[PDB]
Each structure stands twice: as C-alpha cells, then as structure tokens.
C-alpha cells in the first residue's frame, strides 16, 4: 500500500533532520526506511511521512 | 503475502541459532523480524525462513 512516499529523520549525533528516505515498513511507532544502500529502523516519533 | 512464518537467526556474540521470530519485511538479502517487543534487521544469510 506504500506508493511513492519520502521520509525525513534526525540522527543520534545531531537533532538536525536528514535528507529524504524511502518508506518501506509501517506499523507501530516505528518505520523502516533506506537512505543509502542500507535499511535501518527509526522511531516514528523521530521521522515524518511526506507524500511524493 | 507473509502469512504464518517463523525465522531463526544467530547473534553477533555467538554463532548459535536463536529462538524463532516473526517474519515481516522480505526483499534483498535482508529480513526484518521481531523477537521480543522490538524489531531489528538481520542479514538473510544469517537467518532461515521456516514455515509455520
């Protein structure tokens, strides 16, 4: 059901937002994404769902 | 498309397999699962897809 959606997220070294990422898994207060060629887990409260 | 499937995986502190887990994301050589109440990423080459 996830079509074209971008997501922003902050790093643990700086509360500064980071470039957009691809949205893959979406359920509880957590969202799986992929910035470079590596998938990682990010708390939903530290990410934002933007539409493409 | 993921119905009832269990997955085993080894830890980084010991090449010993670990209890079964729930299969959620499935794509490249990586698989997202959930053992306790926390989701983590595990390389597909370090996990096994078992049917329920």
Swiss-Prot record, chains A, B:
Residues 5-52 bind DNA. Specific enzymatic cleavages by the viral protease yield mature proteins. Transmembrane segments: none annotated. This is Gag-Pol polyprotein. It comes from Human immunodeficiency virus type 1 group M subtype D (isolate Z6). The gene is gag-pol. The chain holds residues 80 to 130 of 148 of the full protein.
